[PDB]
């Protein structure tokens, strides 16, 4: 599986931008672009060889973890730390089989009894995303915490939190140039801060936004998607056009309709 390397140690907007673009690049098959927005490969019929990408994370503590990301949704499905691999509870038997092809050389393989969704992760962490700071510091700490879980030095809540940080700064950043931008700004000013309502609502609405765009009539949404701005004010999305600078990747939701060209 393709590997993308990133270190939080001395991370800059550029090195982070390079990292997200590389991840996004590996996530972009070029086979499916809907209104200038790449669509992630459909899960059905997707060969196991084309299923995962690896995100090797290093930090200032000289620790390394390797996150496995699912091509179909850019989601972290689990990670490797040393001779151990840890996987989120598979949502189905197909995914359960799929993950057996990840880190096949580790001595120890563990599947968490919990999934890698925010709701579960937030409950486990004892904190909502809103109250979990993001930035290079949080990610630096997330990597150490993920690594020390393999040596028994990390509690499950801190894990969870760490997963929440990693997912937003990697999976959501790849999915959204906007969220990438939010992370870039954090790094630019060494800012450590919880995601504002614009980041939260984009994350929550990623699937619905993907569906709305793919099911849109020439880009026009049949029904608006309610988002929030940075200040928390209601922002309604009626069209793909305003999402083009915002959403970088879509989860596959339907086949592109036969081109109805004028």
Numbering used by the authors: 6 to 267
The authors write:
The RiVax immunogen is a double mutant of RTA that combines the Y80A mutation to inactivate catalysis with the V76M mutation to ensure the removal of any trace VLS activity from the immunogen. Here, the crystal structure of RiVax was solved to 2.1 Å resolution and it was shown that it is superposable with that of the ricin toxin A-chain from Ricinus communis with a root-mean-square deviation of 0.6 Å over 258 Cα atoms. The X-ray crystal structure can be superposed onto that of RTA with a root-mean-square deviation (r.m.s.d.) of 0.6 Å over 258 Cα atoms, demonstrating that the Y80A and V76M mutations found in RiVax do not significantly perturb the overall protein fold or alter the conformation of residues corresponding to known neutralizing epitopes. Neither the active-site mutation (Y80A) nor the VLS mutation (V76M) significantly alters the side-chain conformations of adjacent residues. The enzymatic activity of RTA is the primary source of toxicity and therefore must be attenuated for safe vaccine development; this can be achieved by the introduction of a single point mutation, Y80A. Disruption of the VLP by a V76M mutation was shown to prevent RTA-induced weight loss, a biological marker of VLS, in specific animal models. The HTH contains a type I reverse turn between Phe181 and Ile184 which connects the two antiparallel helices of RiVax. In contrast to RiVax or RTA, the crystal structure of the RTA 1–33/44–198 R48C/T77C immunogen reveals that truncation of the C-terminus converts the HTH into a helical segment. Examination of the GD-12 epitope in the X-­ray crystal structures suggests that unlike UNIVAX 70/138, the binding site for GD-12 is partially buried in the folded protein. The results demonstrate the composition of the RiVax clinical material and will guide ongoing protein-engineering strategies to develop improved immunogens.
